[PDB]
Design a protein around this motif. Structure first.
Motif, PDB file in Angstrom:
ATOM      1  N   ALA A   1       1.148   6.563  -7.035  1.00 24.63           N
ATOM      2  CA  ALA A   1      -0.039   7.371  -7.313  1.00 24.63           C
ATOM      3  C   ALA A   1       0.275   8.860  -7.270  1.00 24.63           C
ATOM      4  O   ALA A   1      -0.063   9.591  -8.201  1.00 24.63           O
ATOM      5  N   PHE A   2       0.947   9.292  -6.210  1.00 23.30           N
ATOM      6  CA  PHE A   2       1.385  10.680  -6.083  1.00 23.30           C
ATOM      7  C   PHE A   2       2.299  11.109  -7.229  1.00 23.30           C
ATOM      8  O   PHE A   2       2.146  12.218  -7.751  1.00 23.30           O
TER       9      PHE A   2
ATOM     10  N   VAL B   1      -6.218  12.440 -11.741  1.00 21.37           N
ATOM     11  CA  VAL B   1      -6.282  11.978 -10.357  1.00 21.37           C
ATOM     12  C   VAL B   1      -6.553  10.480 -10.291  1.00 21.37           C
ATOM     13  O   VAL B   1      -7.066   9.887 -11.234  1.00 21.37           O
ATOM     14  N   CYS B   2      -6.201   9.894  -9.153  1.00 15.33           N
ATOM     15  CA  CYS B   2      -6.123   8.446  -8.991  1.00 15.33           C
ATOM     16  C   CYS B   2      -7.319   7.946  -8.178  1.00 15.33           C
ATOM     17  O   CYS B   2      -7.462   8.323  -7.021  1.00 15.33           O
ATOM     18  N   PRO B   3      -8.199   7.124  -8.787  1.00 15.68           N
ATOM     19  CA  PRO B   3      -9.353   6.592  -8.049  1.00 15.68           C
ATOM     20  C   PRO B   3      -8.986   5.749  -6.834  1.00 15.68           C
ATOM     21  O   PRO B   3      -7.822   5.383  -6.646  1.00 15.68           O
ATOM     22  N   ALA B   4      -9.985   5.444  -6.020  1.00 11.04           N
ATOM     23  CA  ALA B   4      -9.820   4.461  -4.974  1.00 11.04           C
ATOM     24  C   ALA B   4      -9.295   3.147  -5.580  1.00 11.04           C
ATOM     25  O   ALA B   4      -9.649   2.787  -6.699  1.00 11.04           O
ATOM     26  N   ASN B   5      -8.420   2.471  -4.838  1.00  4.80           N
ATOM     27  CA  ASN B   5      -7.854   1.158  -5.208  1.00  4.80           C
ATOM     28  C   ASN B   5      -6.960   1.192  -6.469  1.00  4.80           C
ATOM     29  O   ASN B   5      -6.522   0.137  -6.930  1.00  4.80           O
TER      30      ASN B   5
ATOM     31  N   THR C   1     -15.414   7.612  -6.259  1.00 10.16           N
ATOM     32  CA  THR C   1     -14.811   6.304  -6.446  1.00 10.16           C
ATOM     33  C   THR C   1     -14.539   5.619  -5.115  1.00 10.16           C
ATOM     34  O   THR C   1     -14.600   4.399  -5.037  1.00 10.16           O
TER      35      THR C   1
ATOM     36  N   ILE D   1      -8.711   9.772 -13.776  1.00  6.19           N
ATOM     37  CA  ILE D   1      -9.761  10.763 -14.037  1.00  6.19           C
ATOM     38  C   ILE D   1      -9.156  12.122 -14.376  1.00  6.19           C
ATOM     39  O   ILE D   1      -8.345  12.647 -13.614  1.00  6.19           O
TER      40      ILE D   1
ATOM     41  N   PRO E   1      -5.543  14.610  -4.438  1.00  7.86           N
ATOM     42  CA  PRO E   1      -5.588  13.867  -5.723  1.00  7.86           C
ATOM     43  C   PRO E   1      -5.437  12.326  -5.702  1.00  7.86           C
ATOM     44  O   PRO E   1      -5.466  11.725  -6.775  1.00  7.86           O
ATOM     45  N   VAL E   2      -5.280  11.692  -4.532  1.00  8.29           N
ATOM     46  CA  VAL E   2      -5.053  10.247  -4.465  1.00  8.29           C
ATOM     47  C   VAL E   2      -6.054   9.570  -3.543  1.00  8.29           C
ATOM     48  O   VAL E   2      -6.076   9.815  -2.338  1.00  8.29           O
TER      49      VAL E   2
ATOM     50  N   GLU F   1       0.817  -1.216   0.000  1.00  8.18           N
ATOM     51  CA  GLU F   1       0.000   0.000   0.000  1.00  8.18           C
ATOM     52  C   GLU F   1       0.847   1.260   0.000  1.00  8.18           C
ATOM     53  O   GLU F   1       0.470   2.238  -0.622  1.00  8.18           O
TER      54      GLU F   1
ATOM     55  N   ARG G   1      -7.868   6.418  -1.510  1.00  6.46           N
ATOM     56  CA  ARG G   1      -7.432   5.426  -0.526  1.00  6.46           C
ATOM     57  C   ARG G   1      -7.760   3.999  -0.964  1.00  6.46           C
ATOM     58  O   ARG G   1      -8.443   3.781  -1.965  1.00  6.46           O
TER      59      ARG G   1
ATOM     60  N   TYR H   1     -13.954   8.677 -17.739  1.00  6.50           N
ATOM     61  CA  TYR H   1     -13.678   7.662 -16.708  1.00  6.50           C
ATOM     62  C   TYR H   1     -14.941   6.955 -16.176  1.00  6.50           C
ATOM     63  O   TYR H   1     -14.984   5.718 -16.102  1.00  6.50           O
ATOM     64  N   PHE H   2     -15.935   7.745 -15.777  1.00  5.78           N
ATOM     65  CA  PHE H   2     -17.155   7.210 -15.168  1.00  5.78           C
ATOM     66  C   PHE H   2     -17.940   6.336 -16.118  1.00  5.78           C
ATOM     67  O   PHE H   2     -18.477   5.304 -15.701  1.00  5.78           O
TER      68      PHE H   2
ATOM     69  N   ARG I   1       2.107   1.627  -3.547  1.00  2.46           N
ATOM     70  CA  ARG I   1       0.984   2.078  -4.368  1.00  2.46           C
ATOM     71  C   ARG I   1       0.813   3.589  -4.248  1.00  2.46           C
ATOM     72  O   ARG I   1       0.684   4.292  -5.254  1.00  2.46           O
ATOM     73  N   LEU I   2       0.843   4.080  -3.012  1.00  2.00           N
ATOM     74  CA  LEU I   2       0.682   5.499  -2.729  1.00  2.00           C
ATOM     75  C   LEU I   2       1.818   6.345  -3.294  1.00  2.00           C
ATOM     76  O   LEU I   2       1.556   7.357  -3.940  1.00  2.00           O
TER      77      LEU I   2
ATOM     78  N   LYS J   1     -22.520   6.126 -13.705  1.00  2.00           N
ATOM     79  CA  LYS J   1     -22.111   6.460 -15.080  1.00  2.00           C
ATOM     80  C   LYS J   1     -21.863   7.959 -15.256  1.00  2.00           C
ATOM     81  O   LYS J   1     -20.972   8.345 -16.013  1.00  2.00           O
TER      82      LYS J   1
END
Lengths: 195, 195, 195, 195, 195, 195
Positions: free
Chosen positions: A158-159, A168-172, B50, A180, B144-145, A151, B147, A190-191, A154-155, B89
């Motif tokens: 992402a940064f 920007v970086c979605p959850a997970n 997200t 996005i 921007p990140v 984790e 979790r 994205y959505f 990952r972080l 969506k």
């Protein structure tokens, strides 16, 4: 200077064990690099070695993304070295690819807001500091639960991804998964894609 | 009462959207349960939905381990409900299995140390509060990140594992992986096994 | 209460390593007994182990005169145990017949006036404390020079001698060497004999 | 300036008996020399003459290593001379090879922290002071037990050894016995040697 | 500066939604123009949308008299945009011909004296501000009762009329209804006519 | 007590002209009634008589809805009566159906926040006060523009409607026009109805 997200990381200096030898380290030394600064309570305990060895095994992947990793406790650098010269089978660390910083004064732990004054040891605090010395993330666990090295990596990525792509970086989020564009119109891409 | 690990979580109260309707929630209401309290900046943005949808999809797994999940922002409960009535969506939330708490006064964000006073919104702060209202873990990301929901679940289970087994959880621990008896003699079993 | 000769030894409490296990020790525990309380800078160093192993090897002779020996440093109890489990020829301690007290908070060293605040470690201070908790002798060495265990023992026996014979002990006094009756006429026995 | 190890020794000035003559002595006079400054309670007592004659008899061995010895009490220089002109058979000193300093104002004892204010006399405090006027060692005995001249000489030579060899002196170190190079790899030479 | 008739309107700055896009707006931007600045409690509520859509539908008539209309609430600019993108028959706003200003910090409402601190939302306050930034009229409704757009417009035209004709406007004045020359002899024209 | 919406209206007492007679009036006298308390600058001016006669002509419509109307200026009750005894043709009032209150001390205007201290007269402030003495609405015009009697009556009836029906009144609401049930699902009935 404060231990909170968006602020400049408090300045620290002390003696570390790097490559089996004693060497002074400070926050200045990491200007131009990402720093993962993590605190653990005590050498020769239980959860702590498992975190240190897991970070050291994964260290190459941090270095490849311009990220240093530094473990910090209130123990002396001599204790740190003895723990390196203890094999993993016997609860030791073995060979280390990360620095082990000694916070013998306890002032580093104090300044990062992780010292338990009554006990004289740090909680499991972790800080991801950027090349300009700004804290992008912090996490704290109570003593009986180790952290996730995966984790943390990952972080850090992402940064770095948001810094060089402006999305920007979605959850997970993992590398190569969808990101996005952060405006109402462009976000729609994205959505629509993931739903 | 303070937002730090080992301390009692600051008291909060406000209006939440639970099951499509407006309902008051407070810290008292979670006595006897684990609480994941997480803060996001703003409704109708990019990373935030997200995280909320990922927590809501995984919500059943939290409830099975006696853990509630509550999302918090400075927006009104009416805005929260409109965002629930927006499809995923189109950047919305859709049906929710978690509470959405409105911190309209901004005082909850202030009291948990996550409000950016200048902007009037919360950073991505997350708190794992135990049944006695004690904080076991906290984490903060810059805006921007997103979790990791998986990591949050891992942590809730780890804390529950140590509470009911009296062994500690190594780095990267997942359920059924090895744990450590936290005394020098009994710890040897773990270290021998994995090395 | 203060760390000065003729004054009552300051109160201390901490976790020690006694016979390979962790045990709480305080100054109360030595009521009725003589106590050699000595401070050393750091585990896994150079002069330090030699002092600790010399006191341990000689501990039976202090015990036969109702005197306990406690070594103190700012290292954790876990670090002490690791140093005990390190063999003497690798700079460890081996089996210990003395208690190793952990002053993790540094407050014991501070209270006994031997802490170097700037470094967070103790000077080589030693204290002989009688059965009523009164300091009869104190010595401090700078860090590169070890103390004499032989001299410590001689001083314990000398204080014990005067307490049960009412005669005072000359310079370089060893057991069965002549002593002085401390009044003018009676002292001439001693002075006529040795000259 | 304080009477503590690592610190500069407090300044002193007073009248001394040197070769049976009155002569002023200050701390400045011992610049470039090692100094054993030792306090005793009172002239024409019992332990005191035994310490003073033992130091005078061995004074050649201190002078041969660039170390002066100066005995100090609160008595007058006229009283010191009276004592010098009293034979040892009668509890006197006889001919002296060391200076007898008078601390008639009691300020020297007061500045060095060994004065019992209520009695107006000094405890058995000893200070080893280097050529730069820094305290390397201090010891204090309660009144009824004399110090060891042997141990004082051992300590002076030990401090001289480390200054001119860069190796640290183990517990019970005597000249020509083994020493330790104070770095982790190089210290193994010592621990392997003596085990 | 204060929110009172005859006084200069307090300075504000914030992010607004202007024609479906985010734009910074301040009081300076309305120099040279009349400004209807009105506050409403919350997006996605009940009276609020009806006020906003009525002002928007009538906005061309204010614009033809050099008057801008700005709606203000404590909701985020993202929430405003979401409400714009919600159709009128689902309680949304649809296309807007007025700016929707976001007072996310709540400081604009505080400065205009309309913030309910306890709730964190604005009362229904409305302000008519002239081209020199002076308040000519102000009104406040409690939350369940909407304002009259028709009356707002009448008051803007009336203030404009007096500024370019030097006659004052009677109660219930509409354009082309009789006005009063504001001196005693000249006023009789008006009073003789309407009676 | 403050002149703010939601708050209790400040207490007042003074002498009024009622049916051509002098009579004391206080805020207590309107307990159980709605009250339109409106301030005007000066008797024998220009906008003022037009407002006062328009309110008196429509006063039956306010009385029919349990609402009194009380005009207030800083003039004396003798001056008010003079004005009443001046025909409308000459800029007077004629017969009155409302009370003319004298605020001769200027304290009423001062307590209600509408006094211009430097001029000694009140702005065109209007207050709608409910049966419990709470302010539901306030408006203030600068001196040269008269208020709308129509809009004042609309607002009194609007506040009465919500109190006895539990539905909120849209922008431009007139009696018998549609209203909104103030909860999210039920409000759809209104928005579907008017779109």
């Amino acid at each position: 200077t404060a231990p909170a997200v968006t602020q400049h990381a408090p300045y620290f200096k002390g003696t570390a064990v790097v490559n089996g030898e004693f060497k002074d380290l400070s926050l200045d030394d990491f200007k131009g690099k990402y720093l993962v600064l993590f605190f653990y309570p005590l050498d020769f305990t239980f959860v702590c070695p498992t975190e240190i060895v897991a970070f050291s095994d994964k260290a190459n992947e941090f270095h490849d993304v311009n990220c240093e990793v530094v473990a910090v406790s209130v123990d002396s650098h001599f204790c740190h070295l003895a723990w390196i010269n203890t094999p993993r089978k016997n609860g030791g660390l073995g060979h280390m690819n990360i620095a082990l910083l000694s916070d013998l004064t306890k002032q580093i732990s104090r300044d990062y807001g992780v010292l338990l004054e009554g006990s004289g040891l740090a909680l499991r605090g972790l800080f991801i500091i950027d090349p300009n010395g700004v804290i992008k993330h912090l996490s704290v666990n109570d003593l009986p639960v180790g952290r996730s090295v995966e984790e943390t990596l990952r972080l850090v990525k992402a940064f770095q991804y948001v810094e060089t792509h402006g999305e920007v970086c979605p959850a997970n989020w993992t590398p190569d998964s969808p990101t996005i564009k952060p405006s109402p119109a462009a976000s729609k891409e994205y959505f629509q894609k993931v739903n």
